[PDB]
C-alpha cells in the first residue's frame, strides 16, 4: 500500500539517482552521492529540465480563473424506440434536420480561481453539472457552448491560446482505466518516457538510459516499483489491481508534463482504502511537479477531504459555495443548517442539496430569519455572501493580466511498443501461423493427384489453384484489424496529450505487422507451390511469391482504410463483406474477362486482384507446351488419321498439334496477352502506396403480500476444498429474521458477507453445508428457492424491454399459475406505486449510457423480486455498493418502506455511512473467517451495539466517529488493527449469546413442481420476449436484409443471363458457388444476440427458477427461423430471375416445380446458416471463438464441394469429406434445378474445327464417333472443306460431368433438411452438456 512520498520513496529515488550518476561515468542539495541529499529537489529538477527548454514557450505553471462561466446545451427533445420499421423515418427526419434555436441552460453563471499546486474537488449530486464544469474549465468544449459573457484565463494565456499552442498543458480524463492490457507497467511507462525526453538537452548519458531512469523514478514516486513486470491488464486480463491501475495513469500523465488537469469520475469502483491512496498520489504530484488538478468524486471520505484545498459545491447547475476546503462547513452552518454529529464534511456538503436529508437549525427558524431552501435562493445567498466579495477580488487580480521528438523517433518507439505487445501475447500470432500452415497443407493435398500428369486435362485446375492461392494470400492479414480497434482508444488518449502524431501510430501499425506477413507468405506459399506442382523454375517461383506479397499488402492496406472509417468491427462487417465479395468475385476467374458484361467492366478495371491474377496466369502458362490428353475424334474406327483430321478438346488448340501452346489458351479464354506480364505488379504497387497514404491521412484527420415464516438458522457451518481440502469459511454462525424487520449483515475483508447469503439462499454450487437451516422449525425443501427473492448486486436486464414489460414478464412466469393475467397486472401496479416509479414505467431499460440511470436500475432490480410475491425473505446483496451518498440513502429509505409494509429483508452492506446505520433494525457482524461477533438490535444511534462492545473491553468510541468503521477497528479487519483480544470468544461467553441460543431453542417450538409454469407457457412467453428483442434491434435486422439484398443481387446481375455456352455453364456453376459465401457474415451477425440473451439467462434467470433451459433454447430455435425464411425468399426473388434460370425452366415446361424447389432451397440454406450459427455457439463462452470455428468448418465444407475440384480429380483420401459435407448436396441440387433439360450453344471460339478425310462429308466422317459416344452436334453436315464441332448436345450431359443430376433434386433436398435437423439437435445436446449444471 501507499503512504504518499514517505521515507521509502526518498530512499529509492536516491538509490536510482546514484545509479544514474555512476552509469554516467565514462550542489549537495541535489547530488545523489553527497550528504543531506533531498529527493524532492532532484525530481523537481528533472521536471524543470523536461519543461524549460531554451526554444520552447511552454509555460512554467498554469493556474486558472473564470468568471461568469455559462454553458448551454442542445434541447432534450422527445425520443422513441427505434423499432425495425421506425428506423427509416427516423433516419429521414434526422438527415433532414442535420441538412436543414432550441437549447437549454446547463450551468448558470459561475466564478472561481485555482492556483498552481492546489487541489479542487467538485462536489454535487449526479447530473448537477460536474462533468460540464470540468470540461469547460479545461477548454474541451464539445457537445455544448459557452455563453458570450464567459471569460477564462490560464494565468495569462486565453482559452484560444492553449488550443493552438499548448494543448497538453490542459488535460481532461473522463476515466483513468484506458490502458493497453498486454504490456507491463514498465513497458507502458518507459515508452512514454522515451517519447518525452528533450532530445537536444541531455549530456553524458545516452538517450535510453535517461529514459529508463525517468520511468523508474516516475514509478517510485507513485508507489508502483513493485509492479515493474506485471501486465497492466483489464477486467478480463489479470494484472495490477484497480488502484494500482489508476495510479499508472497518473504516473503516465506526470511524465507527459501536463501542468493543469481534470479527473471527472476518478474513483469509480474503489473502496475507501484505495480512493484515498489515489487522491494522495495526485496530491504528491501537485506537491512535487507543481501542477494543479480538479477531481470530481462521489463518497468522499473525511480522510480524503482533508487533503483538498478548495471545494466547489453544485446544485441543479448552480454554484452554492467555492472557497477554502475547511471553511465550507462553517459557512453552511451559518447558512441555517446543522451538521449531525457523525456525518462527514463531504456528505454534509452534498446532502444539504437534497430536501429529504436536510436538518434545519431550529433556532434560526424560531427567530423568523429566512433560510434558503431551493438552489436558486442558495445561489442568491452565496452571491450576497462576503466569501463571494473575497472570491471576486481573487479572480479579478488574475483576470486583469510541438511534439518533443522528431517524427522518426515517434515512429520508432511506437514500433518497439507494438513489438512488445506481440511478444507478450504471442499465442495470437502462433494461432495465425499454425492456421495458415494447416490450410496450405490441407488445400494443397486436394490438388495433389490431378496436377502430377501435367496434360491438357488440368487447365481448369491450374486456374482454380491460382484462385485459391491468390485469395488465401490476400485475405490472410485481416486478423490484424482486431489490434487496430483495441489500440484506438489509447491512441485517442495520447492525441489529447501533445505526445505524437496519429499518423505516427498508424505508420508504426503498418510496419509492426510486416514480420508476420513475411513469415506467412513464405510458409504458406512454399507448401502450396510445392504440393500443387506448378512450374519448378525458380525464376518464375520468385515472381509468383512477389505477386502474392503484393496482393497481401494491397488488401491489408485497403481494409485498414475500411476499418479506420467505422467506429467498431460490428460496423465494418457489412461494408467489408460487400467489398470482399466485389473483389473476390471479379478476380477474373469466376467471370472471365471475355464474359464480363458492359455495365460492370469498370469494376474489373479497378480491382487490383484482377491484374495480379492476370500476371500469375501469364507467368504460369506463357511459353510452355502442354501435351494433349484426348482428341475429339476417338475410337477404334479412327485408327488411321492424318495430322489435320483431329484437334484437342481445349480452347487454344490447333489441328495437327501434339500439344497446345498455353499462351494460346490464356489468349482464348481470358484474353491475357503475354506483353502484360508486369502490368499487374505495377498497378499493385500503385494501389499499395495510394491506399497506405489514404490510411495515414484518414488516421491523421479522423398492498404487498406479507411474510409468514420466521426464517432462522443454527450451528450453520461451511467448508470448501478448492484452495485447500476441508477448510471452514463459516464457523457456527447462528441467527434469525422476523417478518417486518430490516436486518443487515456486515463483515470485514475476511468474513463471508456474501457466503452467508449464498449458503442461506441455497445458491452455492460447491462444498458441503453442515447444520440445519429451518423455516418454521422444520428444514427447507425443494420448494424453498421459489419463495425467496434475491436482488443481485449487479443490474442486468434485457436492454430492449421496458420497465412495465420487465415487471410483468417475471410476474407471469414466477407467480403461481392459478391467478388470472388480470390480477397479476393489478399487483404489478401495486409494485410500481410502492416503488414510486410510475412516471417512467414505460421507459426502455437500455444501458447505463442511454437509458435508466443507476438508481433507477437498482430500484428496478428490487421491483422484479417483489412482483414474484415471495413469502419468505427478500435477500439483497450490497444494494448501496457503487451508489453515492444520496442515492444510497434513497435506496435505504425504499428498503425501510418495504420492511414496514411487512416484507422481511436480509441485506448485505459494505461500508455504510453513519447516517445509514441507524436505519437497520438489527445486525450480524463477523470476523476474519466466518466467526460471529455481534448479533442484536442496532439500537437508536447505534447505542446498543456500542454499549455491548464497550462493556466487554473495547476502547471507547469518539463522540463523532463512524460506528460502522469504529467496530471494524475494534476487532481486527483493519490494516494494522492489532485487536486487544479475540472477540469471538467474548461473544461465545457473553450474555447475548445465551439469550440468542435460548430464543432459538424457543424457536424450535414454533412449528405448530420446481417450476411454476409448464414448459409450453414458458416457451410462449420467452419467445414473445425474444421476438420483441429482434424487433427493436433495427441494426441486426437491417444489416441482415441489406447485406442479403446486395450480395445476392450483385451476384445475380453480374451473370445476368449467362447463356448456355460451355463457359456459360461453368459461370453459372460458379454463380451458385458464390451464392453461399454469405454464410459467414450472417452467422457472425446472428451470434451476438444469442450471447446477450444467454448471458442474461445463465446469470439471473437460471438460479431464480424463472424458466427451464428447454424453454430458453426452444425460444431461440423457434424465433430465429421465421426471419431466415423471409430472408431466403427475398434472396430467391432477386437471385433466381436476373441470372436467367427461369428462362431455362420455361423451355422444359417445368417452370412451377423448378421455381418452387429453388425457392425451397433458397429458404433452407438460410435456415441452415442459422442452425449452424446456433450449434457453434451452443458450447462457447465467447462469440469470436464461435465465429472462428464456424468459418473454419464452412471453409472446409466449401473447398471440398466438388466445384473447385471435381470428385474424380480429388485424392483417394478426401472422398469421404466430399460425401459428408452438406454444400455438395446443396450445389448439386441447385445447379441441376437451374440448368437442366436444355440444349447447349457452343460459341464461335469454343467450337473445334478441322478437316475431313478426302472424298467424304463431315457427317459421314464424324457419325461413328457420335455412336461410340452418345452426345455432340455438328453445326454443318454438307461442308467439305472444314467442320465445327461441339462436344455437348444438352446441358444434361454437362451436369453429369459436374456430377450433378436433375433426377436427384428432391433426394438432395431431403438430405439438406436432415442436416438442418441434425445441427439443431446437436446444438441442444451440446448446450445441455457444456452449460447446464
Numbering used by the authors: 31 to 56, 92 to 165, 170 to 470, 496 to 796, 861 to 1166, 1178 to 1502
From the paper:
Pdr5, a member of the extensive ABC transporter superfamily, is representative of a clinically relevant subgroup involved in pleiotropic drug resistance. Pdr5 and its homologues drive drug efflux through uncoupled hydrolysis of nucleotides, enabling organisms such as baker’s yeast and pathogenic fungi to survive in the presence of chemically diverse antifungal agents. In Pdr5, one of the NBS is catalytically active (NBS2), while the other (NBS1) is inactive due to multiple substitutions in crucial residues of all but one motif. Here, we present the molecular structure of Pdr5 solved with single particle cryo-EM, revealing details of an ATP-driven conformational cycle, which mechanically drives drug translocation through an amphipathic channel, and a clamping switch within a conserved linker loop that acts as a nucleotide sensor.
The sample with Pdr5 alone produced a map containing no nucleotide ligands, which we refer to as the apo-Pdr5 state. The apo-Pdr5, ADP-Pdr5, and R6G-Pdr5 are in inward-facing conformations and are very similar; the differences are limited to small structural rearrangements around the nucleotide-binding sites when ADP and ATP are present. In the apo-Pdr5, the arch of the LD2 connecting the TMD1 and NBD2 is not as well defined in the map, and the short helix H17 could not be resolved. This could indicate that ATP binding in the degenerated site has a stabilising effect on that part of the LD, possibly through the contact of E804 with the ribose, as well as an electrostatic interaction of the Q801 side-chain with the triphosphate (at least in ADP-Pdr5). In the apo-Pdr5 structure, the residues of the conserved MQKGEIL motif cannot be discerned in the density, indicating that the motif plays a structural role, perhaps ensuring that the linker domain becomes more conformationally rigid when a nucleotide is bound in NBS1.
